[PDB]
């Protein structure tokens, strides 16, 4: 299928409690493979998936130096942002950035990403052209002018079209037995009486990878989107994910309801019913 590398940067100021924590985590699709945390006793880029451990010391030293430098960079950026919004040195604030690349089944660049947010609100984003910016407000326009003067978009374009894709392809090969393996959901329907008048039918998808899935109920072949309770896809802790969808049905009408499942690991889409 298609694949992505993405890095997720979070920096959080905490006045009176030291300097802002910086954490970077790296993902290929739904699999975390590295972390860096300035609050670790000995901050270092560390492996978080088995396939990355074979990288040599040069990889770990170089990514650690980048993160130690980004740490100071994001701390100075937080000071600048506080000024751009006329905020007090009193409060805590958050700077988030995500960047990386998507490739298709042929390993070819689909698109690149570089987006930032301040206090949970979108702040500035590299456009899909990897050459121009979208700023959310007059503060982000200051950043945009600064990044235009320093040719940041050109640096990002070179990284995203080169380094990023080259390393994503490398990771996909080194971890092909997991990263390029789709695990299908194990599916079943349970029945939970509510009253004499109705019961819950719950359609389960367990143990699947990656997290992308479609899970719906139909009544007489008509989608029940508005009447379905659909929990967020949730991690099991063994790399796989879980999800369920539930509908409330009148007693005796259970056979009018069908659960439909689509996922990359399935030979074909599934249709399930309550089997009493």
């Amino acid at each position: 299928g298609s694949h992505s590398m993405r890095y997720f940067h979070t920096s959080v100021s905490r006045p009176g409690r030291g300097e802002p924590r910086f954490i970077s985590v790296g993902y290929v699709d739904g699999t975390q493979f590295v972390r860096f945390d300035s609050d670790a006793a000995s901050p270092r880029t560390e492996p978080r998936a088995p396939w990355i451990e074979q990288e040599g010391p040069e990889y770990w030293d170089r990514n650690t130096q980048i993160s130690k430098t980004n740490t100071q960079t994001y701390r100075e950026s937080l000071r600048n942002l506080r000024g751009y919004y006329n905020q007090s040195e009193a409060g805590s604030h958050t700077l988030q950035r995500m960047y990386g690349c998507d490739v298709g089944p042929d390993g070819r660049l689909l698109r690149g990403h570089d987006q930032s947010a301040y206090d949970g609100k979108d702040y500035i984003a590299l456009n899909e052209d990897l050459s121009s910016w979208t700023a959310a407000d007059t503060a982000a326009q200051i950043t945009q002018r600064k990044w235009e003067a320093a040719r940041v978009a050109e640096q990002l374009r070179a990284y995203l079209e080169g380094t990023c894709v080259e390393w994503l392809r490398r990771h996909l090969e080194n971890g092909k037995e997991t990263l390029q393996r789709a695990d299908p959901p194990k599916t079943h329907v349970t029945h939970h009486p509510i009253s004499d008048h109705e019961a819950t039918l719950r359609c389960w998808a367990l143990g699947f990878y990656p997290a992308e899935i479609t899970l719906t109920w139909q009544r007489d072949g008509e989608d029940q989107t508005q009447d379905t309770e659909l929990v967020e896809t949730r991690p099991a802790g063994d790399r796989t994910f879980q999800k369920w969808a539930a509908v409330v049905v009148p007693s005796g009408e259970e056979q009018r309801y069908t659960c439909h499942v689509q996922h990359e690991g399935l030979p074909k889409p599934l249709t399930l019913r309550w089997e009493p």
Partner: peptide
């Protein structure tokens, strides 16, 4: 590999 950003916000 990560990218190194040296220009501040």
């Amino acid at each position: 590999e990560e990218i190194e950003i040296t220009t501040h916000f």
